[PDB]
């Protein structure tokens, strides 16, 4: 009943774009895209069906 549902997780990252108080996704030492870890990358496009 209802809809039955799996899910996935990721988490994204940004960073200050040479600390100038704005931020995005340059500039970045890690991974675009992580998991909750920090270091495991988790691109949201590199999940599939």
């Known amino acids: 009943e209802g809809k039955?549902?799996?899910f996935a997780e990721t988490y994204e990252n940004e960073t200050?774009?040479?600390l100038v108080?704005?931020?995005g996704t340059t500039?970045?030492?890690y991974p675009k895209?992580?998991?909750v870890?920090?270091?495991i990358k988790l691109?949201?496009?590199s999940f599939r069906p």
């Open 4 to 6: 039955l549902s799996v």
């Open 16 to 18: 200050k774009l040479a």
């Open 21 to 23: 108080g704005n931020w």
């Open 27 to 29: 500039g970045l030492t």
């Open 33 to 35: 895209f992580s998991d």
């Open 37 to 39: 870890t920090g270091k």
């Open 43 to 45: 691109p949201k496009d």
